[PDB]
Paper text:
Bet v 2 is a plant profilin panallergen, i.e., it is ubiquitously distributed throughout nature and shares a highly conserved amino acid sequence of up to 75% even between distantly-related organisms. Additionally to its ability to bind actin, profilins also interact with poly-l-proline and phosphoinositides. In this study, we present crystal structures of Bet v 2 in the reduced (without disulfide bridge) and the oxidized (with disulfide bridge) states at a resolution of 2.0 and 1.7 Å respectively. The reduced and oxidized structures were determined at a high resolution of 2.0 Å and 1.7 Å, respectively. Both structures share a central six-stranded antiparallel β-sheet with two N- and the C-terminal α-helices flanking the sheet at one side and a third helix flanking the sheet on the opposite side.
Residue numbers in the entry: 2 to 13, 22 to 133
The structure:
């Protein structure tokens, strides 16, 4: 099934998703939150303007994260409690990874990187 394909190729407590720059879901794991378009817009702006989201924090699914060091124009990183969020920009899409202990930041960061690696390799 599509969902078993997605769940085993994405990060699946942790969740992950591939979202177009226009905000449409290309694939999301079973527990990935619904999000708001304005949330995607501010994320797209932080990729243009590093530090943009830092004074207000990063919001996804209404959840507030503290912005930390990412990769300018390419990766956003956020922390909350014992978990956090990683967002990688590709040519056409955004890869999201959300994690909570005992999932580690490094586990999430690497699933996101691998997804972006695949998408960019496909020209997306």
């Amino acid at each position: 099934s599509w969902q078993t394909y997605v769940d085993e190729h994405l990060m699946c407590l942790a969740a992950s998703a591939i979202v177009g720059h226009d905000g449409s879901v290309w694939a999301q794991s079973s527990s990935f939150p619904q999000f708001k378009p304005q949330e995607i817009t501010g994320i797209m702006k932080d990729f243009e303007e590093p530090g943009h989201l830092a004074p207000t924090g990063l919001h996804l699914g209404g959840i507030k994260y503290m912005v930390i060091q990412g990769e300018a124009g390419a990766v956003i990183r956020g922390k909350k409690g014992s978990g956090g969020i990683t967002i990688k920009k590709t040519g056409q899409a955004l890869v999201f990874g959300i994690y909570e202990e005992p999932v580690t930041p490094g586990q999430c960061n690497m699933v996101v990187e691998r997804l972006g690696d695949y998408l960019i390799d496909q020209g997306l």
